[PDB]
Amino acid sequence: QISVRGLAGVENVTELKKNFNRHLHFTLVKDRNVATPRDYYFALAHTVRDHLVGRWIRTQQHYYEKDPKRIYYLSLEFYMGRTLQNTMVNLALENACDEATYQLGLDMEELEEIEEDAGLGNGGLGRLAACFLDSMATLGLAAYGYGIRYEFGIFNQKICGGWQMEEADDWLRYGNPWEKARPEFTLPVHFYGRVEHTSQGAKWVDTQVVLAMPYDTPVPGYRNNVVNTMRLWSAKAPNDFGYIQAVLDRNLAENISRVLYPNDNFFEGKELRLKQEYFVVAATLQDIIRRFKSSTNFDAFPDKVAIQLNDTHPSLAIPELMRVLVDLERLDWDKAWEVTVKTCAYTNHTVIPEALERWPVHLLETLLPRHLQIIYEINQRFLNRVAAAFPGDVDRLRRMSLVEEGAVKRINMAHLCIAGSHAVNGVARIHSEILKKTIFKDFYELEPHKFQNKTNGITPRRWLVLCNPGLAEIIAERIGEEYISDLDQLRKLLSYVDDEAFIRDVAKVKQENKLKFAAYLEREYKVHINPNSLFDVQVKRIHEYKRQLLNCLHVITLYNRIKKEPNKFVVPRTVMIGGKAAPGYHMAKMIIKLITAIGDVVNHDPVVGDRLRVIFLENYRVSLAEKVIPAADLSEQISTAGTEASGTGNMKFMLNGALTIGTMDGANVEMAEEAGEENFFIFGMRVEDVDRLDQRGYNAQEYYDRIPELRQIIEQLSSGFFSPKQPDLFKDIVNMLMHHDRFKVFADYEEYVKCQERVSALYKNPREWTRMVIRNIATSGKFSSDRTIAQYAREIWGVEPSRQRLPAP
Amino acid sequence: QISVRGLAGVENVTELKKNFNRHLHFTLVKDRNVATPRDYYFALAHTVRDHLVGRWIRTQQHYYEKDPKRIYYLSLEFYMGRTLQNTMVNLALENACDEATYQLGLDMEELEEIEEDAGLGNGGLGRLAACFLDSMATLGLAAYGYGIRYEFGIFNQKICGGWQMEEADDWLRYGNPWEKARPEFTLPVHFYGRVEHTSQGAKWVDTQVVLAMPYDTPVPGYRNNVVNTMRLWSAKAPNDFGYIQAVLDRNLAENISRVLYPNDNFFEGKELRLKQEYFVVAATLQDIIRRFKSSTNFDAFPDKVAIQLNDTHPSLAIPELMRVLVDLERLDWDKAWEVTVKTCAYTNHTVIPEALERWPVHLLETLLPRHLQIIYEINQRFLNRVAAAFPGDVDRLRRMSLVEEGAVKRINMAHLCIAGSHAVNGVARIHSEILKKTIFKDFYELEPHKFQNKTNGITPRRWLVLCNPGLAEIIAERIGEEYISDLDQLRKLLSYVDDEAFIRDVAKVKQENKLKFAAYLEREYKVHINPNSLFDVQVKRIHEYKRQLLNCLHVITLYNRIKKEPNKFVVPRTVMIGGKAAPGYHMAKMIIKLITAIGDVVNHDPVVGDRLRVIFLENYRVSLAEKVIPAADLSEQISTAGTEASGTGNMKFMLNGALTIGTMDGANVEMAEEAGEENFFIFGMRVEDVDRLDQRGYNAQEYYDRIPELRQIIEQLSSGFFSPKQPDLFKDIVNMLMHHDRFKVFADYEEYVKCQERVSALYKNPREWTRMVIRNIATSGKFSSDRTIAQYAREIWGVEPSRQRLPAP
Ligand SMILES: O=C(N[C@@H]1O[C@H](CO)[C@@H](O)[C@H](O)[C@H]1O)C(F)(F)F
Ligand SMILES: O=C(N[C@@H]1O[C@H](CO)[C@@H](O)[C@H](O)[C@H]1O)C(F)(F)F
Ligand SMILES: *Cc1c(COP(=O)(O)O)cnc(C)c1O
């Protein structure tokens, strides 16, 4: 029972125990004789949920009364993770429930492990949406998250024979106690059809109809009694439509919300994905307009509504809003456009070419004929403005067009978003600058005022208090609990950098987390890691730009050095790498095989002993991140400079006591700036260096010829040293590294290895390592999503955040 | 507030109101400001459900302790209807909830109309299963109903342009508060594959797996605190099985429990239907064996288990039980067969050839290879016994074989059921006799001891107390409430046949029900019936053997007679016909069109006035039956003698104050016997007369030539009198009646019309009509399903029914 977990008052504990038994009986229809751990988990979940409803109802009633400006965050992904503990934390019910369940003879931690992750996201983009919802509630904003209720989220990853196997994430199998179906608010969504031009306006007719049924999930703010809503739409066929066959084919319409596309930073132009994108936008906008008409001059629309587009996925919101205002409300084009631009804002999350959405015209033409017409009109009017500002610059006109010519005509959704939004932002200072100097340079020159920066952040509730109570406690002991909702206060810890007691406590918490994780590794998965070794961790989606391959080269280097001088001392390390590969990404799947293949050799070499271990963490997800991050010593953030827009895992590691080894990419730059470069392990090419190399031409052979250790590794891979039975198993990997590596792994190899040596040197000095850690934790305040959201609120949405408690429950 | 509805004590009402508000708040997450009638319905449903759980848990605990013989009723259909009122009735909570909701400013009757019917059945067979579950709980039997949870039940019928239109019955859209998902008890079901013969036994391998997830619904007995279980299986794909496509194809496995085949007395040999049949049998038997091993000598299996097969739909239970005992438990064939025969019993529900299941061998061969082998072995051993009992009778061998030769080999499932069951029963005395003299004559000669009769019945709770409180009340006033669970006591009403007060009350209740229904007809559907007319009703599924066409001929006759002598007095009538037609049954759909077509002419003829009205009751279902039956004066039960196995609607009408006009078919024979033929309107050919006609040869032309009035009707139909714009619209109907009428409508026409004249004559004498009604109600006791179930229990299952209250809640 620790401080930050709240009070366990003898009135609340008694009440919780009583309600727990009531739900077990009436809700689950069970008794203590046949109840299983899962039944107990649900009884607790319903009990905690009850405390949420009263606050949920009055929060919504409050917004109705005060009628503030509403913020609508549109996203195709919300990576929520588990909800039980987070709810207890935000309601200050953790110790009380811990005590209550204890008295009932149950271990609450065991029950929490039963909850399924709500994996409605792929990684960074989806988790950001989740942290944002938490911060918006904590800052008292009338915010609504709108998305899709996929019945199958990100697939569960299994490793067989060292290869990734995918299996359906049937997360709703045992039910979801957090959501509340609202079938009464079902809305129709139209597809296909054709456009008819009548006396007064165009009409979209002969369409196929799919119903959108909403499910609401509560989003509690941190101890302020505010509970916002996340509304997720589910596809339903109308009862309108051989009898048997007709009923069975209903599943054709309902497939829209069936599964999440498992791609991270990769565009797949499939019809089903386009349907999902329009589905969420169409249902959401009707809901927004309906709520507004209760709040008909749409001139005040922008004063009461703000729509934030999470990348281009919900970009159809722009032409859909125009369609409704022009075709249905009958506003003149110019007025409708003014309203649209003023309510929409766009956030770009990547500059990688293969990740940008460019939809084939023939697809939109067939699926959304009216929207295509509106997009052409928008393009026509936009290009007229470009032509007026840059007379005779024809090359500029074709570069800025929303319509892309070539093999097949495509619509550049990013161009559409910029043209129809009053603000466009990047997610890290360096990323936002790259947008203005390269990808969106032409647009920045036309409308400089639209471009902004909003550096990403993470919520300190889930990423500190929830996953690392031990650290939150020792910090609270010295500076109070105020920092949990005002992370900048962590700076006060700077005056404890020479405090012998604090140094000891910080190191003790880390050691306990490592023992806790090392245990979990054996209990689940039966591994064999040594808690005394340096925990070197790289967890994130598998992708070539992330460079898990560079990490692999270092691991093999360490192994070869040990085999060369067996009785020479080296700082023991446990290298952990985890992450999922998109099912259709061949190279990513081969990288996973390589990692397990290296472990097969290294982990069973008698000469290596327990000085080096290579472990691939299976099924990396939010719940696993909450376990491994607090236990890490070294955070690997090694993407090629200019490719990771921001990164967020990097922030989680910094807040939890791990030092960082990384490139000057994304938010790493601002992190190093806040902590001081001397307290960061920076290495490799800077963005400018990468450009110079491309000017000259990247030739990997050069590095291979001049670096003996590197040559040895490539020869081991090519000869079958890591794949005896299949000598050429890794031929594709070697071929790519040698002839077509877009991310120049070899170019940063030497500096990476040398930087890693400096990390080992510091680890040998426990006291100085811990002092540097304190320097990092103390300056991580800027990376709280509360800061990020406060900036979006003031600089983009035009609303003031608030910390005032809502009038109790 | 009437007597039979229970007490409304000031302690219970206060408690109900408090729990009602709690559910509205915590469960529905609403407040009195945004709540709609549907929200109030759910708040009440959850409140009533709560009172059911405590009794549900202890009932199951009781069975576990005493370990009585268990009864398993297997059926592919359970036509439950609505559950709220039935639950209140059985728990004696109706007046209390009426008062509680009244104090909350709500009308409970309005809320009850919001509940969706659980239409998991087609008609008679499915409703019988439902009445049986009610009676088994009321008689204290450890019974379990096992079936399939179709996500789409019997389709909702819409009438457009006088034609039937079908629309999906999405009954689970707003959720089902009565069921409790039990995902923890999920079981695997195998399909396809092949058979491998090993050293010790055969093995069924390389199968496709589909999971069966159970949902439990409580079944409360009448005021005895017993709550049994109805377990319905739902199909789930294993998470085992392009990534996207693979996930979308999961719906291929889950289609098994998607929709109920909408056929009544018609066999459709489709693969999907076969999968549904094995699915329910496979999951159920594993559940049964699992529960048994807790209760390994299977010799005691028949002493602890009874499996009742509702027709041949679950017939695969026989070979599946053999498969498990022989292949899995490793019992010798002879021992396994002894156990199987002793635990299984089969109930036949029809003699109509097109309704009997005869599955093509090639289907079983591909879908269930091991079962086909077992069926061949059973057939081989069975025929060996036949050959030994009737040496040299080769014709007998081919007639009795389970394998039917011909175009395509088929398995006669009825033969399989008789061979593998220790008891076979018909559902009405005349039907059971027909089985022994015709269809199953050979089997009866071989094993006479197996054949029995169990005349159908209906539950007096739903079919009297629930739907006709007014009548239940006036009856209770004179003889007490004991008859509700001992219907034979209604005989005491015979001593009131000359009681002027009772006569007046019986007639008053009927008039009130008629006004109540006449109102509903306008409020919903905007009709124009006259409450003073005789309510002539025929409601049941549309089928040629039911002869809705004969009724049509009478209606047209009445119309023509009025047009012939306009100013002659005739007893006013409101003829109501309702029922659904199977989607693929052309003739049935044409009959519906004919009925609406007749109404279009008759209802708008100025000369007819309000002396005759023809109304087609749309979407006939259980909830509608509860409204129209209590309001009927005349019950039409006119199937051709020997075609309606029993009928159950006939019993509902008799118990509710309507007189019956019908043929000596099914249970009509026993009803007339109980009430006295003088108190019934019997007409037409008897079974023997139908046979004589077939011997001679049925020639409809003869009747057409000798009956002028009949000739006129056929000429009106043929000339387009009832279809001006489409003169030959009813050509198919006329052609069938004249050249290929298997049910000889013309043969009973004259006697039918004359009998109808006798009905009108009696109606003109209110006092004598009511006295005959009292004679019917008073002798309807034999038709209580409590009597039927008591007989199944004692003569087939070997268990004693009980009326003892269970040790409170
Ligand atoms: O997932 C995408 N972008 C991702 O967004 C997150 C959140 O801003 C960033 O931290 C990360 O660097 C970036 O790759 C996308 F969609 F752009 F490909
Ligand atoms: O539905 C069928 N049979 C029906 O069963 C009910 C219930 O016993 C009888 O009352 C009815 O007469 C009969 O047609 C079936 F399945 F046999 F076609
Ligand atoms: C935070 C998080 C991410 C993002 O990690 P990066 O290293 O920024 O790519 C991805 N997946 C999960 C489950 C996360 O919690």
Ligand SMILES: *Cc1c(COP(=O)(O)O)cnc(C)c1O
């Ligand atoms: C009782 C009932 C039936 C059976 O009626 P019969 O006239 O015996 O065919 C059919 N449908 C419903 C909804 C019923 O309640």
